[PDB]
Design a binder for this molecule. Structure first.
Ligand SMILES: N[C@@H](CCC(=O)N[C@@H](CS)C(=O)NCC(=O)O)C(=O)O
Ligand SMILES: N[C@@H](CCC(=O)N[C@@H](CS)C(=O)NCC(=O)O)C(=O)O
Ligand SMILES: N[C@@H](CCC(=O)N[C@@H](CS)C(=O)NCC(=O)O)C(=O)O
Ligand SMILES: N[C@@H](CCC(=O)N[C@@H](CS)C(=O)NCC(=O)O)C(=O)O
Lengths: 207, 205
């Protein structure tokens, strides 16, 4: 059994996507980010960075005590290694998959997140910052598009945790002042993943 | 033989740290970020995100063609898996190590980088943005400090790629307007890593 500490956000959806694709049983535990649920002492023991997603794995491979883990990328990697699913063991595909996973964690997520912040959450309109993250958002979509023009999926011929990590952020394009049609390979890939049954199951759970 | 495409930056130093700690032979290939070396077509083939670090591994495990890789975190993980060094195979320590490695890549690096930008590189002074990333930098140091109060190293009892990923960023604490003495466990950990012989070799280049 996996407990998933969750809020309906791009980083939360990464994990529901994986769990639905892998067919793992899990319990969704809602953390109310608006009311400071992420700062509760009992939650900080699981997620000392005060963020979701976090999991608690009640059946770890070593047969021991529940295993807690935060960082969506570490969770995806952990679950992929545990299940043998959505991450290749072959060195080339595995390397390419990890490359794009870390690119999402270090680039796509953080920068699109700043885009969201300065456009929607900041109490003042700051054109320099808005422009900075807008240009960077476009750069990232351009990089993503160029890769997806060259391969069906980010890591190679198989859907993987790299695609799973990127999709919920691309799915938020509507908030990012991006025209997704300007990136046709991203658009088609986004649509393709949206049409997978597990993706629909994950979104319905978010409700 | 590993080719390392490099600039003297926190992310560049992650990989020299690893290579020196692991005792791997490598060639340093300088990419001039100031002159747009990261946009050269031949380099974009290796690093399509137009950034350093990137490596080319000329003796990959599969015996095949040179293997190119970008993202400092993927490079660390790749080299750790290849060598068996600085990443545990035991499931608990491995999970904790990966947790803090991803935390660095998604949090410490990006936010301290924004701190650097708005304080030193931006052509205008933007107090809201400076404050946002200052506060977040403080938060990240507080999280890092708390973990280091509870464990000698980020992933457990052993130095790992998680520590290696974080250190060059902490080593830039002066640029971040952070008082490292406010984070005593970070301060001691920073001093400890600085004193390791490989660290000195990496900085010396
Ligand atoms: N790098 C982290 C980012 C996680 C993250 O940003 N979580 C947000 C929700 S999407 C959060 O919990 N924010 C709470 C807060 O900042 O107080 C990951 O990939 O898991
Ligand atoms: N404390 C955050 C709250 C907002 C938040 O957590 N945003 C998430 C998206 S739900 C984010 O930007 N995560 C960045 C990432 O995933 O790396 C802020 O001020 O930006
Ligand atoms: N997430 C990336 C970040 C790498 C990065 O920010 N590289 C900088 C140097 S530290 C770079 O090459 N900048 C060139 C540019 O942005 O044009 C990683 O961990 O490797
Ligand atoms: N294009 C970058 C140029 C400066 C740069 O590459 N900064 C690196 C540090 S050398 C950075 O902040 N990387 C963020 C990370 O490592 O995630 C910018 O405008 O911020």
């Amino acid at each position: 059994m996996i407990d998933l500490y969750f809020a309906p956000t791009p980083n939360g959806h990464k994990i529901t996507l994986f769990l639905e694709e892998a067919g793992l049983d899990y319990r969704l535990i809602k953390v109310d980010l608006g009311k400071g649920g992420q700062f509760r002492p009992e939650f900080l023991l699981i997620s000392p960075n005060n963020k979701i997603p976090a999991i608690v794995d009640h059946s770890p491979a070593d047969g021991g005590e529940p295993l807690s883990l935060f960082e969506s990328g570490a969770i995806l990697l952990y679950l992929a290694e545990k299940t043998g699913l959505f991450l290749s063991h072959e060195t080339r595909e595995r390397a390419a998959t990890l490359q794009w996973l870390f690119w999402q964690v270090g680039g796509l997520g953080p920068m699109l997140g700043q885009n969201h912040h300065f456009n929607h959450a900041a109490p003042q309109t700051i054109p320099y910052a808005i422009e900075r993250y807008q240009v960077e958002t476009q750069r990232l979509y351009h990089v993503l598009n160029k890769r997806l023009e060259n391969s069906p999926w980010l890591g190679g011929e198989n859907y993987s945790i790299a695609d799973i990590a990127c999709w919920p952020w691309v799915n938020a394009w509507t908030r990012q002042r991006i025209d997704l049609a300007m990136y046709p390979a991203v658009k088609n890939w986004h649509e393709r993943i949206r049409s997978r049954p597990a993706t629909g199951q994950a979104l319905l759970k978010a409700q």
